[PDB]
Design an enzyme around this catalytic site. Structure first.
Site, PDB file in Angstrom:
ATOM      1  CG  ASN B 104      -1.871  -1.134   1.321  1.00 25.88           C
ATOM      2  OD1 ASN B 104      -2.333  -1.661   0.308  1.00 25.88           O
ATOM      3  ND2 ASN B 104      -2.181  -1.546   2.547  1.00 25.88           N
ATOM      4  CB  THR B 154      11.872 -13.778 -30.266  1.00 25.89           C
ATOM      5  OG1 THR B 154      12.524 -13.467 -29.026  1.00 25.89           O
ATOM      6  CG2 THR B 154      10.365 -13.912 -30.026  1.00 25.89           C
ATOM      7  CE  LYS B 156      10.455 -11.021 -32.526  1.00 28.22           C
ATOM      8  NZ  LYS B 156       9.699 -10.685 -31.287  1.00 28.22           N
ATOM      9  CE  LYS B 158       5.306  -8.915 -29.813  1.00 28.61           C
ATOM     10  NZ  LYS B 158       6.618  -9.024 -29.112  1.00 28.61           N
ATOM     11  CE  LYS B 182      12.069 -15.473 -25.513  1.00 30.73           C
ATOM     12  NZ  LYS B 182      10.895 -14.806 -26.010  1.00 30.73           N
ATOM     13  CG  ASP B 184       7.431 -12.539 -29.606  1.00 28.36           C
ATOM     14  OD1 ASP B 184       7.947 -11.764 -28.771  1.00 28.36           O
ATOM     15  OD2 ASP B 184       7.625 -12.438 -30.835  1.00 28.36           O
ATOM     16  CD  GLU B 185       6.699 -10.534 -25.747  1.00 24.05           C
ATOM     17  OE1 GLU B 185       7.918 -10.752 -25.912  1.00 24.05           O
ATOM     18  OE2 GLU B 185       5.973 -10.023 -26.624  1.00 24.05           O
ATOM     19  CG  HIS B 275       9.633 -12.482 -21.716  1.00 14.21           C
ATOM     20  ND1 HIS B 275       8.897 -11.345 -21.460  1.00 14.21           N
ATOM     21  CD2 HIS B 275      10.242 -12.276 -22.907  1.00 14.21           C
ATOM     22  CE1 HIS B 275       9.061 -10.486 -22.450  1.00 14.21           C
ATOM     23  NE2 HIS B 275       9.871 -11.028 -23.342  1.00 14.21           N
ATOM     24  NE  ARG B 276      13.924  -7.134 -19.082  1.00 12.25           N
ATOM     25  CZ  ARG B 276      14.873  -6.219 -18.919  1.00 12.25           C
ATOM     26  NH1 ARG B 276      15.299  -5.911 -17.701  1.00 12.25           N
ATOM     27  NH2 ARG B 276      15.388  -5.606 -19.975  1.00 12.25           N
ATOM     28  CG  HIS B 308      14.691 -11.420 -21.622  1.00 11.12           C
ATOM     29  ND1 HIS B 308      14.544 -11.057 -22.944  1.00 11.12           N
ATOM     30  CD2 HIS B 308      14.337 -12.725 -21.550  1.00 11.12           C
ATOM     31  CE1 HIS B 308      14.125 -12.098 -23.642  1.00 11.12           C
ATOM     32  NE2 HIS B 308      13.991 -13.123 -22.820  1.00 11.12           N
ATOM     33  CE  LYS B 315      12.641  -4.882 -29.866  1.00 11.31           C
ATOM     34  NZ  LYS B 315      11.953  -5.738 -30.870  1.00 11.31           N
ATOM     35  CB  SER B 360      16.515 -10.492 -26.116  1.00 11.34           C
ATOM     36  OG  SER B 360      15.615 -10.697 -27.190  1.00 11.34           O
TER      37      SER B 360
HETATM   38  O1  LIG Z   1       9.309  -9.249 -28.212  1.00 10.12           O
HETATM   39  C1  LIG Z   1      10.450  -8.817 -28.500  1.00 10.12           C
HETATM   40  O2  LIG Z   1      10.706  -7.660 -28.883  1.00 10.12           O
HETATM   41  C2  LIG Z   1      11.603  -9.829 -28.367  1.00 10.12           C
HETATM   42  O3  LIG Z   1      11.118 -11.053 -28.847  1.00 10.12           O
HETATM   43  C3  LIG Z   1      12.788  -9.303 -29.204  1.00 10.12           C
HETATM   44  O4  LIG Z   1      12.493  -9.521 -30.544  1.00 10.12           O
HETATM   45  P1  LIG Z   1      13.769  -9.063 -31.669  1.00 10.12           P
HETATM   46  O5  LIG Z   1      14.846 -10.070 -31.274  1.00 10.12           O
HETATM   47  O6  LIG Z   1      13.149  -9.240 -33.047  1.00 10.12           O
HETATM   48  O7  LIG Z   1      14.127  -7.624 -31.339  1.00 10.12           O
HETATM   49  C4  LIG Z   1      11.995  -9.940 -26.860  1.00 10.12           C
HETATM   50  O8  LIG Z   1      10.892 -10.406 -26.120  1.00 10.12           O
HETATM   51  C5  LIG Z   1      12.502  -8.594 -26.274  1.00 10.12           C
HETATM   52  O9  LIG Z   1      13.866  -8.390 -26.449  1.00 10.12           O
HETATM   53  C6  LIG Z   1      12.206  -8.542 -24.765  1.00 10.12           C
HETATM   54  O10 LIG Z   1      12.732  -7.353 -24.312  1.00 10.12           O
HETATM   55  P2  LIG Z   1      13.765  -7.519 -22.879  1.00 10.12           P
HETATM   56  O11 LIG Z   1      14.769  -8.543 -23.392  1.00 10.12           O
HETATM   57  O12 LIG Z   1      14.293  -6.113 -22.685  1.00 10.12           O
HETATM   58  O13 LIG Z   1      12.851  -8.036 -21.783  1.00 10.12           O
HETATM   59  O1  LIG Z   2      -3.420  -1.827   5.276  1.00  8.47           O
HETATM   60  C1  LIG Z   2      -4.179  -0.829   5.318  1.00  8.47           C
HETATM   61  O2  LIG Z   2      -3.810   0.359   5.370  1.00  8.47           O
HETATM   62  C2  LIG Z   2      -5.682  -1.150   5.337  1.00  8.47           C
HETATM   63  O3  LIG Z   2      -5.812  -2.334   6.074  1.00  8.47           O
HETATM   64  C3  LIG Z   2      -6.405   0.059   5.980  1.00  8.47           C
HETATM   65  O4  LIG Z   2      -6.205  -0.032   7.341  1.00  8.47           O
HETATM   66  P1  LIG Z   2      -6.921   1.276   8.276  1.00  8.47           P
HETATM   67  O5  LIG Z   2      -8.402   0.942   8.098  1.00  8.47           O
HETATM   68  O6  LIG Z   2      -6.353   1.114   9.669  1.00  8.47           O
HETATM   69  O7  LIG Z   2      -6.477   2.545   7.571  1.00  8.47           O
HETATM   70  C4  LIG Z   2      -6.180  -1.393   3.887  1.00  8.47           C
HETATM   71  O8  LIG Z   2      -5.508  -2.511   3.405  1.00  8.47           O
HETATM   72  C5  LIG Z   2      -5.986  -0.185   2.966  1.00  8.47           C
HETATM   73  O9  LIG Z   2      -7.040   0.713   3.051  1.00  8.47           O
HETATM   74  C6  LIG Z   2      -5.885  -0.638   1.494  1.00  8.47           C
HETATM   75  O10 LIG Z   2      -5.745   0.522   0.745  1.00  8.47           O
HETATM   76  P2  LIG Z   2      -6.809   0.589  -0.669  1.00  8.47           P
HETATM   77  O11 LIG Z   2      -8.168   0.320  -0.033  1.00  8.47           O
HETATM   78  O12 LIG Z   2      -6.619   1.986  -1.211  1.00  8.47           O
HETATM   79  O13 LIG Z   2      -6.292  -0.536  -1.547  1.00  8.47           O
HETATM   80 MG   LIG Z   3      -4.348  -3.698   4.885  1.00  2.97          MG
HETATM   81 MG   LIG Z   4       9.325 -11.162 -27.352  1.00  2.00          MG
END
Ligand SMILES: O=C(O)[C@@](O)(COP(=O)(O)O)[C@H](O)[C@H](O)COP(=O)(O)O
Ligand SMILES: O=C(O)[C@@](O)(COP(=O)(O)O)[C@H](O)[C@H](O)COP(=O)(O)O
Ligand SMILES: [Mg+2]
Ligand SMILES: [Mg+2]
Ligand SMILES: O=C(O)[C@@](O)(COP(=O)(O)O)[C@H](O)[C@H](O)COP(=O)(O)O
Ligand SMILES: [Mg+2]
Lengths: 99, 448, 452, 452, 105, 99, 105, 91
Positions: B104, B154, B156, B158, B182, B184-185, B275-276, B308, B315, B360
């Site tokens: 939070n 990857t 292509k 995609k 691989k 694609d994600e 993959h991230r 990754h 790019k 990548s």
């Molecule tokens: O979807 C794409 O763009 C790729 O397949 C690259 O294709 P190309 O090889 O044709 O560029 C990879 O997932 C990215 O590099 C992920 O980015 P990161 O590695 O930064 O997570």
């Molecule tokens: O952890 C906390 O702060 C709470 O338990 C509130 O406690 P209090 O009632 O003691 O403030 C809730 O999880 C938040 O309100 C979530 O925020 P949202 O609803 O914006 O996701």
């Molecule tokens: Mg809470």
């Molecule tokens: Mg990809």
């Protein structure tokens, strides 16, 4: 029906009760008072009389709350509790008044 | 008890607290609302990510908050250091870490922007995690590949290719010299390409390229799906077909399902490419979010065999200094603090296996000198467009990318400066490899 | 074929394209790298979230990119509208939506900041999702609670309480008038409080408070855990104990495990409270990220029975206009567009059940008139600190909040202006409720800045 | 409330109603009881298939019949158009569609005959169904067979053959050029031929014929059985043996068990051939029943990979125009209306996979030109008697049919008119294929009447 | 060894092959050429003779590639493919050349 | 058949091989020699020629072993290896001689 | 024994009850009356006092039925219901009369 | 050196073979410092004193117990009679 700690001893006098409260305070524990009209193995949440007396300084203060609770709930079982927030658990609990 | 609102600072700011070796430490980049002091903003984050809330509660006295509360113990500039007792966290659960640390506190009115820059995971909490199911050393031993970056790419377009056409591209790539290919994600199971059909055809291509080349091959089959049950089903089938690999989008699928798949991958003998996807939503801007090095730590703890890390020169955006720090975090047993790379804490990895970095995104042969210089041998270099985009198709493109890597590695090992002589190394190799020459001419004017 | 690099806009910018009713539409606020034309920035997002990459590939000619490519069909101000064909997406998978729409395009050098403001989910794709298993109207029937917002509260301290102490606080809250109580999002299973211990003791408290008050109660038991199998195990135990509810942190656990738990919840007859922990990592800043309204649509598609929506007036940030739009997106059958609330598209829900908004965080009795005015009846108001921080403890605090809600509701139904008379209505009710007076005096000077 | 009987048309006939895009629409050909006005007959069908009964009930006022009632919105000739709201139907359940649309309304005294001609499945409801697991294009890829109709045939005698003899016929057919063979719809598990015995021996024949010819083969193993559990068990054994196919009688087994088997088929990687046994019980007569095109839509929604469609020219009845409409409904992505083919509504399939039409029953070599002209390439042509009835047996018969198909395809691709030159193309091919000449001479005088 | 479509007809002449290639092109489909010495049910991926001929305009251009492939791989089966990128499915595939040993068993 | 690292470059001369050996030694890694007549994806355990040369000080020592293994196994593939006991894995492996 | 909506406020006067009934009717919702001697979490179905008042036009008509029910069942809890047939959900339910013993414990 | 969560592995190393070497004629493991980092791989008691006292609702005294005797030889029903007598008497 038995009521756990000290239930197999004769019913405690006010003086014996106060000594237990003194034991609770001397060790830095928190005294409390709970009461119910439904004692028994099924009941693990007796009614709180106020909150646990975190600010209690003397045993006499606690005994005054016990009498007040006794007067307000003469038909209930009333127990003294002692609580330790370090182990986070109750370190003592016994019935001080039986209806 | 004493009811009422108190400043968070009175309970959760302790500049005299000495962090324990068991504490989890966070480096928060705090941008307070105007008029809110930094000590109060930091205390608000410490409080609302551990034990506190906006007003004093009677139940606080039922426990020992001195034992359980987080504490801001040091503030340097706009960075607050907060220490969390070990007992606050559920063993082996990244999900729980996030629920406290990023639950939070990023949406409080009192804190206008907030970024988690780094985290010191104590050795005692790391030992509750299994780490990668394979790890760099075991993976090289399974592949029988030593002494060079590994080649990937990857497929292509995609999306839009049928299962049968898809594996045709895979076959051409692998038989041309790539070690892996691989999904694609975003290629999971879709009307134009269902996962069962793809897994079957891909593994026919893999086996065929392995027999023709004599080198062990693999394809990162994406098991990412809408439910954990479907992900586990797809992993099971990849293992039935003898695939060495599966793939998971660990952020979009999420850490709980990621943990499920990682456990099953180890049970099935599968290596796990990660993959991230989605990371840049919150790890890019310097004022708000979670830095990728934190994500990389969580990734290594759960257990991915690769992740990754960026290319720097491609790019997609990436900071060279940060990338070098992240590469160490993924591969080394111990990483000392280094302000010049954004490493706020020393990180002991407590014997967890290391993770392959994967570079990548928009890279081609001319980038190989730089990439070898940045990552060394323990990395994958992926060429999607840089393979299929070759004037003569994917087999020729794969050969060019494999030759470039091997040529640069050889030059490095002979004592040459591969940055100063990178062009000459490639031109020399191209005299014996027409595929490489054609790639160099096509992309010679493509920089990012 | 013609190899080499081409500008993205040659293939993926098409201002003549007419979106189809089956197209998934995105509104991206785009900040290009200086020197990159907006049209090229937008085409790069369209290309790299559908079919394209950085150079032409021979295999493009093996398929019909006219069918599969995403297309930026309109650029207005700094907002690019991009249409995605139906066939690009895996049925019923929020995970797949994320993997395309927000997978890589937020990290490109050519686009320095990117924020997904809204997304038009087409009916053809929407109905591959089940929606909530319960819904507002069935939940009110299961609870037998009609004509008022519902009352809840987070147990505090967040962490550090034993299972037995945890259940004591629950007992006091519920027997004092709260309809529900909940685990904190970060309370799962920990050395000081293991989940089986908590589940068992809490449900004893729930049953006792229900019997003593005569009103049906619930506790939102958090099943959030490190793996899907563990979350499913904790949901099974919650159902064996007869709990009406479970709780899940759907973003920290993640959407794949979320979908697993929502399936098991319905199979077990449980209502599913969804906590949005981590959302502000994604949705706080207006220049980069994903606005919560998109996350809220995905939430309703998978099928959370409630989700937190913000309070506007509390301790966490939330604009009034944007919150009203989020509530409509969660509760209504059809929501027209309104960019003034950040709704760039209309949204049809084609019969999917409505989700209970949950307003929580830094609120107390003085906020009840505004909260009733913002949300109406179909919402939970949660008082954690606002319950246990009462000078006399959790029971008295629960009573104070329950009376405040009921008093405001009564006055509204009688025809009074609860905004102009909010404070006077509470002061009238306090004359008959000492617990309410004590809460009003304690927190009378506690306020947070508000944004319209 | 006002108790008593009211004419159905007061509540359920509404010619002002505008169908919604989410409405399910039915076209009923209605023959009222003499003296019952068409409007009342149509309103009775609408009432008693949605919300109404024969007298007013107090509980009507507990809901919104304006939302839930079906409505006859148009009567044209003897056809009543009735619109059904989306919320009336259970997602993904053909069984539920049948229970409303054809549950009771065909047996009312006030309506002496009723025939469901067509049904507009709205996209919002369609996409709660998965469609075929494989589809024409993936199936051709799995078989590696392109540019021609595919060849099959039912093993004969229908019943009475041992498992070993059954497999011998399969072997001869497949090694002679048929792509597939199939169990008869009524061959399941019987004293003379138990299913495990057949499955084992047949798959030995399939593997041997594949190895010897070099072309991929299949046999449509019938899993139809008395219970769903038994059908699922037989599908599991078919997959364990490496069969590419299973077969199910989807109407005699029924739609609930059909859906079970289609789910298990995809899980196991099997393609699902669907036999329409019993359909003529429902769809033969033009005054009463359900036309097959409705059954065909339901078939594609659940997800059969093939279904029999008729031959037009063979031994079983099938009008050419109606068959062309059925093929479009099975194979195309969008099918406009055309009452000339019995299509009273358009039908959008929103990406659901296409189903292979299967033409079977009383056909032989002389029919191949007409069959290619009617169906094009994307169809199976099945020759049972037309294979085993060859003077030299099943291998020679298979070769004759395979050559006939290929010859006609070759001629078509070259630009020849296969209808005007059909017989000449076969006679040309027979010069190089004695098996084809023998088939042509045997059945040259065997024809069936045809209807356009 | 049968080879699917048209393999139950007499071996095609160059004129018959060209008519099939014209059929592919007339319909706007993409002709291709593949070859292998390992035909059979387990081989889904024959060897590409170049990439599919996306830019082919006349049937004679394709026949010239067929002759080139036939002269380079006289020991291989060679097939013409026709690809429809709209349905992303092959729409016609047939063998145009078989090695000598095929016909002398 | 390819043989992994450096198999997509022109076959290495003796001088190119020795430079790789020098690279192994320069970094403190342990050189070794393996050989087999059954190379391929199925074989992870080539025959050791002696043990890994833990005591090697010069590249010429390794080239002598390579030439001796060459002479004693002219029908086999022969690879140079470098090993690191810290990561506990081979850091380089390439074919130096093909039959 | 609490009885859900408004049971944490002082017992309602007839004037306060009538205002709530007016709220039900003003919004086009259907007022109803139910009663039971067994209130509590396990009783979802109190006894109908007649059917819901679909044809009620004024609040006074409803108050007259409340008086009738109150006089016939002085030992029962009696609640006013408000039904919205559009959402098919109760939109307001509250107890208007409690038996004597409730308030003398 | 140690397998997470496995006392079995601890014993297999620490007390596996070293008590039987000719070179060491007697050996006693007196104590062991378990590091926090290894302790965290173990779950510890399934209930624990505090939760057990809460499950029993017993506070402020030692708890009473007793082994049924004779050790062996008692039938099931006789065994339960002794149990009944002990428990109803205050154990
Ligand atoms: O979807 C794409 O763009 C790729 O397949 C690259 O294709 P190309 O090889 O044709 O560029 C990879 O997932 C990215 O590099 C992920 O980015 P990161 O590695 O930064 O997570
Ligand atoms: O952890 C906390 O702060 C709470 O338990 C509130 O406690 P209090 O009632 O003691 O403030 C809730 O999880 C938040 O309100 C979530 O925020 P949202 O609803 O914006 O996701
Ligand atoms: Mg809470
Ligand atoms: Mg990809
Ligand atoms: O049982 C039969 O008659 C068949 O095996 C045909 O055998 P022959 O090939 O020997 O005629 C088929 O099941 C029918 O064609 C089905 O009819 P439809 O395709 O119309 O459902
Ligand atoms: Mg039959």
């Amino acid at each position: 029906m038995h009521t756990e700690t000290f239930s197999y001893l004769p019913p405690l006098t006010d003086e014996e009760i106060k000594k237990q409260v003194e034991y609770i305070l001397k060790n830095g524990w928190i005294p409390g008072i709970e009461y119910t009209d439904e004692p028994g193995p099924h009941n693990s949440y007796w009614s709180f009389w106020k909150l646990p007396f975190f600010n209690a300084e003397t045993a006499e203060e606690v005994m005054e709350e016990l009498e007040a609770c006794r007067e307000a709930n003469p038909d209930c079982y009333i127990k003294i509790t002692g609580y330790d927030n370090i182990r986070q658990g109750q370190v003592l609990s016994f019935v001080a008044y039986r209806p | 008890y004493e009811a009422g609102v108190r400043p968070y600072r009175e309970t959760y700011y302790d500049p005299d607290y000495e962090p324990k070796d068991t504490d989890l430490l966070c480096a928060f980049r705090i941008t307070p609302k105007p008029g809110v002091p930094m000590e109060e903003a930091a205390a608000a984050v410490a409080a609302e990510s551990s034990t506190g809330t906006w007003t004093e509660v009677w139940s606080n006295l039922l426990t020992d908050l001195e034992r359980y509360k987080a504490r801001c113990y040091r503030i340097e500039g706009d960075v607050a250091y907060i220490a969390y007792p070990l007992d606050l966290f559920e063993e082996g659960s990244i999900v729980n870490i996030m629920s406290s640390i990023v639950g939070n506190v990023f949406g409080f009115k009192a804190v206008q922007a907030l970024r988690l820059e780094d985290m010191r995971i104590p050795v005692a909490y790391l030992k509750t995690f299994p780490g990668p199911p394979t790890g760099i050393q075991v993976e090289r031993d399974r592949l029988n590949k030593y002494g060079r970056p590994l080649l990937g790419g990857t497929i292509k377009p995609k999306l839009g290719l049928s299962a049968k056409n898809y594996a045709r591209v895979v076959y051409e790539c692998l038989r041309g010299g790539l070690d892996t290919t691989k999904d694609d994600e975003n290629l999971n199971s879709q009307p134009f390409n269902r996962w069962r059909d793809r897994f079957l055809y891909v593994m026919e291509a893999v086996r065929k390229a392995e027999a023709e080349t004599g080198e062990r091959k693999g394809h990162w089959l994406n098991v990412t799906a809408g439910s954990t049950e479907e992900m586990l089903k797809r992993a099971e089938f990849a293992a039935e077909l003898g695939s060495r690999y599966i793939m998971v989008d660990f952020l979009t699928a999420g850490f709980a399902a990621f943990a499920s798949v990682r456990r099953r991958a180890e049970e099935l003998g599968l290596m796990l490419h990660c993959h991230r996807a989605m990371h840049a939503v919150f790890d890019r801007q310097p004022n708000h979010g979670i830095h990728f090095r934190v994500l990389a730590k969580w990734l290594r703890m759960v257990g991915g065999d690769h992740v990754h890390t960026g290319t720097v020169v491609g790019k997609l955006e990436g900071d060279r200094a940060e990338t070098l720090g992240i590469a160490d975090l993924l591969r080394e047993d111990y990483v000392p603090a280094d302000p010049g790379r954004g490493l706020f804490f020393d990180q002991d990895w407590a014997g967890l296996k290391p993770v392959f970095p994967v570079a990548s995104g928009g890279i081609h042969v001319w980038h190989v000198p730089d990439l070898v210089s940045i990552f060394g041998d323990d990395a994958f270099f992926l060429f999607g467009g840089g393979t299929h985009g070759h004037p003569r198709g994917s087999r020729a493109g794969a050969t060019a990318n494999r030759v470039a890597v091997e040529a640069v590695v050889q030059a490095r090992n002979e004592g040459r400066d591969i940055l100063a002589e990178g062009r000459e190394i490639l031109e020399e190799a191209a005299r014996s490899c027409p595929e490489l020459r054609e790639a160099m001419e096509l992309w010679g004017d493509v920089k990012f």
